[PDB]
Amino acid sequence: TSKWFNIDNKIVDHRP
Amino acid sequence: ARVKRGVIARARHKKILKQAKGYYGARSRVYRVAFQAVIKAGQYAYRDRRQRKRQFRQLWIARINAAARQNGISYSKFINGLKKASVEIDRKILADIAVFDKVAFTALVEKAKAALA
Amino acid sequence: RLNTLSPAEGSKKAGKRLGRGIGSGLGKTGGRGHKGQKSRSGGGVRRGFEGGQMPLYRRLPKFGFTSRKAAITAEIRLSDLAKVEGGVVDLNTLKAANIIGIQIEFAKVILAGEVTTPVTVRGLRVTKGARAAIEAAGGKIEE
Amino acid sequence: MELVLKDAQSALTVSETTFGRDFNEALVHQVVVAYAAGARQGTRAQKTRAEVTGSGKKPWRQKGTGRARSGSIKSPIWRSGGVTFAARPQDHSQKVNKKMYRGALKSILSELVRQDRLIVVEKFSVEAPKTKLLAQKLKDMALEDVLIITGELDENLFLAARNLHKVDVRDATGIDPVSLIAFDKVVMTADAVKQVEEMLA
Amino acid sequence: PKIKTVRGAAKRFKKTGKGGFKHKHANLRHILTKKATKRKRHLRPKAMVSKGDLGLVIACLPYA
RNA sequence: UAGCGGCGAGCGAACGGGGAGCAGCCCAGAGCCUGAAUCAGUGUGUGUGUUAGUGGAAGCGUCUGGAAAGGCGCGCGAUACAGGGUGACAGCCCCGUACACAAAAAUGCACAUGCUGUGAGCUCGAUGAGUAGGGCGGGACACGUGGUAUCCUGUCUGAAUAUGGGGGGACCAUCCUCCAAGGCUAAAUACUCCUGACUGACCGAUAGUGAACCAGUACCGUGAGGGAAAGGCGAAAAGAACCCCGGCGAGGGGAGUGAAAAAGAACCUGAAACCGUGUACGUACAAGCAGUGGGAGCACGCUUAGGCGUGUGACUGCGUACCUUUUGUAUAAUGGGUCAGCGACUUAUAUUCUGUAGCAAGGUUAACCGAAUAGGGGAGCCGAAGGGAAACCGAGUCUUAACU
Numbered sequence: 001t002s003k004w005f006n007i008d009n010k011i012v013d014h015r016p
Numbered sequence: 017a018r019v020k021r022g023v024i025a026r027a028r029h030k031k032i033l034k035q036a037k038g039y040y041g042a043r044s045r046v047y048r049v050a051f052q053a054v055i056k057a058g059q060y061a062y063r064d065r066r067q068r069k070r071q072f073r074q075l076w077i078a079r080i081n082a083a084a085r086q087n088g089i090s091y092s093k094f095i096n097g098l099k100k101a102s103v104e105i106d107r108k109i110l111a112d113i114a115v116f117d118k119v120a121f122t123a124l125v126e127k128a129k130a131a132l133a
Numbered sequence: 134r135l136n137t138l139s140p141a142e143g144s145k146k147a148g149k150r151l152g153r154g155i156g157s158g159l160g161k162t163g164g165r166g167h168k169g170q171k172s173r174s175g176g177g178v179r180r181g182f183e184g185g186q187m188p189l190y191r192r193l194p195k196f197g198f199t200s201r202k203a204a205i206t207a208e209i210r211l212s213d214l215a216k217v218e219g220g221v222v223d224l225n226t227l228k229a230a231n232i233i234g235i236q237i238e239f240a241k242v243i244l245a246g247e248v249t250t251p252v253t254v255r256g257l258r259v260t261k262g263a264r265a266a267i268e269a270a271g272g273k274i275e276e
Numbered sequence: 277m278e279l280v281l282k283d284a285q286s287a288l289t290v291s292e293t294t295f296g297r298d299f300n301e302a303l304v305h306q307v308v309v310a311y312a313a314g315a316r317q318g319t320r321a322q323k324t325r326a327e328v329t330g331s332g333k334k335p336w337r338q339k340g341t342g343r344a345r346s347g348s349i350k351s352p353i354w355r356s357g358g359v360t361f362a363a364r365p366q367d368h369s370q371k372v373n374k375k376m377y378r379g380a381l382k383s384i385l386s387e388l389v390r391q392d393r394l395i396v397v398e399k400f401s402v403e404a405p406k407t408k409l410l411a412q413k414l415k416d417m418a419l420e421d422v423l424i425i426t427g428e429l430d431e432n433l434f435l436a437a438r439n440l441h442k443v444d445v446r447d448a449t450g451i452d453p454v455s456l457i458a459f460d461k462v463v464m465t466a467d468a469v470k471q472v473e474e475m476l477a
Numbered sequence: 478p479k480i481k482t483v484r485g486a487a488k489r490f491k492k493t494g495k496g497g498f499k500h501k502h503a504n505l506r507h508i509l510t511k512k513a514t515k516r517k518r519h520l521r522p523k524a525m526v527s528k529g530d531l532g533l534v535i536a537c538l539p540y541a
Numbered sequence: 542u543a544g545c546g547g548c549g550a551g552c553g554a555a556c557g558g559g560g561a562g563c564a565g566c567c568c569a570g571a572g573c574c575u576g577a578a579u580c581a582g583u584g585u586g587u588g589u590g591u592u593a594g595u596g597g598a599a600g601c602g603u604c605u606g607g608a609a610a611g612g613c614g615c616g617c618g619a620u621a622c623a624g625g626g627u628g629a630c631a632g633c634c635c636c637g638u639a640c641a642c643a644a645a646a647a648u649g650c651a652c653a654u655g656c657u658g659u660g661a662g663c664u665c666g667a668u669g670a671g672u673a674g675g676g677c678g679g680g681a682c683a684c685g686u687g688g689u690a691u692c693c694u695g696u697c698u699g700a701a702u703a704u705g706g707g708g709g710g711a712c713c714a715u716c717c718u719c720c721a722a723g724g725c726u727a728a729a730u731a732c733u734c735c736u737g738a739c740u741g742a743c744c745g746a747u748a749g750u751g752a753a754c755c756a757g758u759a760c761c762g763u764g765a766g767g768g769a770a771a772g773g774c775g776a777a778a779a780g781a782a783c784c785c786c787g788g789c790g791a792g793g794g795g796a797g798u799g800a801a802a803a804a805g806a807a808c809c810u811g812a813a814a815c816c817g818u819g820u821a822c823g824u825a826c827a828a829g830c831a832g833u834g835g836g837a838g839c840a841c842g843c844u845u846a847g848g849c850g851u852g853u854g855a856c857u858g859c860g861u862a863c864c865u866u867u868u869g870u871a872u873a874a875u876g877g878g879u880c881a882g883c884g885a886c887u888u889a890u891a892u893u894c895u896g897u898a899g900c901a902a903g904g905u906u907a908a909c910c911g912a913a914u915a916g917g918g919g920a921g922c923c924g925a926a927g928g929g930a931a932a933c934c935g936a937g938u939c940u941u942a943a944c945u
């Protein structure tokens with residue numbers, strides 16, 4: 001499946 | 017008609033690895049890596065066939081020069097002499113004689129000096 | 134001798150293969166170029182299409198009207214009739230000599246040159262030049 | 277064009293146009309090739325992705341797994357199941373114009389004489405349905421490999437030779453292009469010659 | 478399967494003798510009263526499809 | 542093609558012609574004569590196929606070899622040289638093959654009849670109404686309502702009846718042609734779960750069926766359902782008695798079998814990535830795509846030396862991988878851990894051009910017949926005439942009253 005950090009929004013969204 | 021393939025394949029591959037013999041690590045083991053190593057070796061060669069003629073000429077010119085200076089005359093003047101020395105033409109390599117026959121050289125230097133007088 | 138036959142030279146052009154390596158001349162991209170609609174499986178655009186611009190066969194007006202009577206009128210060459218078989222070139226008859234086609238109901242004779250054997254043409258129409266050529270070869274043109 | 281009738285030296289007299297004409301190699305080569313094609317049957321396998329056995333479920337998510345895209349388990353790129361351009365049974369029959377076929381036979385006959393590989397005879401037949409007989413006739417006639425085109429064809433001449441491998445026997449209509457070239461010598465009865473004479477016009 | 482003629486084009490071109498195509502001019506179907514008689518006059522007789530469009534038309538009328 | 546068509550995309554006939562196969566009959570009814578044609582269901586018979594079967598020709602010598610079917614020699618059968626097998630490739634070793642034969646029983650198919658059911662035949666009659674047509678709404682016809690014939694009917698209607706009625710693509714006349722509103726009907730046509738036999742310029746274990754294998758299995762899923770991997774010792778098991786180390790082990794070494802054991806069952810061939818042992822040479826003052834040009838030394842062969850082959854490569858000139866994508870990439874932009882196997886411009890039908898071949902003002906046939914790649918079949922298609930929307934005219938024609 002996918003690692004938790006990839007699914008998680010705060011770490012992943014990082015630069016909008 | 018289905019084509020087996022793969023007997024001709026390792027033919028192509030081994031054809032390359034053989035050319036890679038001697039190279040370090042993957043360059044001699046791993047085709048994908050070897051096929052590159054094999055090409056660039058080729059590339060340098062094609063280049064360095066032309067370089068070879070450059071490298072040696074300046075090798076010759078370098079030692080022509082000391083011997084000339086050794087007989088008290090720069091390379092500049094010394095080739096100009098031989099040029100002007102009533103025509104006359106003679107390879108810069110063949111000035112080999114500078115290493116193996118130093119009287120013959122000095123002898124060539126004089127002949128050159130004379131034309132410059 | 135069954136392995137000594139060979140075809141006429143230049144009767145069997147090999148034919149592009151493409152997609153097989155640098156040397157081939159048609160490797161990688163396969164003569165299709167780089168990107169765009171025209172590359173890509175099933176690419177291309179339909180006939181007549183010229184970008185979204187109004188196409189020629191639509192800028193220009195229609196002007197038809199199909200005779201339908203014309204479809205059943207044949208034209209006859211002088212070169213025929215000699216081949217009619219029976220010296221009478223008739224409403225059909227030509228039809229039987231396979232030079233008209235059943236459905237036909239009308240026929241002109243047309244100066245398409247060369248008539249020799251005297252022949253009488255019957256129930257057809259015939260041009261000024263054709264009549265003259267027929268008659269001048271001993272022919273007869275009764276309606 | 278006269279032909280040495282071999283046994284009862286008699287001469288047969290044949291059409292110069294159908295027995296004395298120049299050898300048109302290309303033109304024959306088209307017909308012999310054509311005949312070899314059409315020998316073919318279709319009969320052929322291979323399942324496009326549309327016909328390999330599996331469901332049409334996407335093997336795994338478009339995005340997310342660290343994996344290549346993947347769409348159908350029957351994809352030619354994948355292992356079991358594929359074949360991009362799977363063949364179908366197909367028909368290799370070529371045309372060959374009427375006038376080209378005839379044109380080839382003529383170039384072929386008119387070359388068999390020129391190598392005297394064609395020996396024409398008044399009558400040819402074996403006395404009983406026994407291979408050994410025919411084997412002897414050929415022996416006596418100095419022959420192993422032979423086509424022997426008979427006039428009307430008889431029972432015994434056929435049953436002999438059925439088992440001799442390099443020798444076949446055909447009636448007048450049975451003449452095909454490969455055979456004329458196939459055998460080392462074509463025999464042909466003078467009776468058959470006249471048949472062929474006309475068949476080719 | 479046989480190619481299908483691009484039916485619309487069939488109704489706007491006719492193959493000529495040497496293999497040309499001839500068509501009716503545009504610009505002559507309405508809003509006429511304001512156009513010179515000279516202009517309208519020149520737009521009556523049919524005209525050959527140009528060299529540049531030949532490619533198109535032929536691809537539309539394989540059975541022309 | 543004619544037509545249909547946001548006259549877009551597309552859809553696409555018929556007339557007539559050549560072929561395959563051809564077949565025609567009942568009811569709407571009563572009288573006489575009566576079970577008379579016929580059809581099915583059925584019993585029997587007969588023939589013919591089927592479901593077990595029978596006979597079936599002819600080879601030996603020697604050489605190599607573990608083994609002959611192979612080579613060489615000399616015979617022999619062949620209506621049998623299809624094919625498989627046998628210690629390597631067999632017409633004559635085996636099983637077959639050609640060919641000739643065989644059915645106690647049960648059956649398919651034809652006829653022939655028995656039994657049942659059924660009606661035949663002649664005379665005189667009868668001739669398909671909630672139908673045709675119409676209105677409204679849809680649907681079918683190549684045809685999108687269009688000038689739209691024709692067909693079907695959900696809805697509301699509704700005739701004529703042989704001096705009658707339908708159709709001939711709006712519609713009318715004339716002409717011509719057919720008889721709706723009841724049915725039956727064989728062949729040419731379609732298909733292959735399955736039976737038999739035969740064939741392939743079809744695959745050969747990542748191929749070919751998912752499945753060459755005890756596979757729809759193991760496995761996954763609540764379930765529908767998904768769905769693998771995995772073939773080869775040898776000619777023959779002759780599949781290793783017995784001895785030794787070891788834990789009455791694992792594993793191993795001898796012995797023995799065999800042509801081979803390096804064919805030992807984790808078994809034909811045994812590649813590559815990858816990991817070791819051995820030897821030669823280099824390497825612990827040296828900086829980078831690791832090679833390339835030069836190049837000593839060392840080890841090894843040479844040669845008779847002779848700055849020669851092979852291996853290594855101090856030192857040294859030059860030198861930022863590949864693909865892709867880009868105006869441009871060492872790029873710190875993409876893709877690749879490595880190897881092996883697989884993995885991407887095909888096929889069919891139309892059309893046009895080039896080459897080439899045939900024939901030539903002609904060329905060629907399609908289906909189909911077939912003595913089946915032949916021969917027949919010219920229905921037809923292309924061309925020899927063009928111009929015009931068209932009638933029509935024709936080496937001209939169109940334009941216009943007419944063309945310099």
Ligand SMILES: N[C@@H](Cc1c[nH]c2ccccc12)C(=O)O
Nearest residue numbers: 002003004005006007008009010
């Ligand atoms: N257990 C996780 C949290 C988590 C679980 N699943 C996730 C999916 C998406 C994001 C976060 C999570 C943690 O270490 O915090």
Ligand SMILES: [Mg+2]
Nearest residue numbers: 066069070073
């Ligand atoms: Mg230079």
Ligand SMILES: [Mg+2]
Nearest residue numbers: 162166167168
């Ligand atoms: Mg690209």
Ligand SMILES: [Mg+2]
Nearest residue numbers: 167168169170
């Ligand atoms: Mg672009």
Ligand SMILES: [Mg+2]
Nearest residue numbers: 166167168169
């Ligand atoms: Mg492009």
Ligand SMILES: [Mg+2]
Nearest residue numbers: 231232234235
């Ligand atoms: Mg005709």
Ligand SMILES: [Mg+2]
Nearest residue numbers: 331332333334
């Ligand atoms: Mg699906």
Ligand SMILES: [Mg+2]
Nearest residue numbers: 341342343344
């Ligand atoms: Mg990955």
Ligand SMILES: [Mg+2]
Nearest residue numbers: 323356357358
């Ligand atoms: Mg497959």
Ligand SMILES: [Mg+2]
Nearest residue numbers: 373374915916
């Ligand atoms: Mg034919």
Ligand SMILES: [Mg+2]
Nearest residue numbers: 505506507509
């Ligand atoms: Mg107008």
Ligand SMILES: [Mg+2]
Nearest residue numbers: 594595596597
């Ligand atoms: Mg038997």
Ligand SMILES: [Mg+2]
Nearest residue numbers: 597598621637
């Ligand atoms: Mg036998």
Ligand SMILES: [Mg+2]
Nearest residue numbers: 668669720721
């Ligand atoms: Mg009626």
Ligand SMILES: [Mg+2]
Nearest residue numbers: 723724725726
């Ligand atoms: Mg019926």
Ligand SMILES: [Mg+2]
Nearest residue numbers: 356746749752
């Ligand atoms: Mg498999």
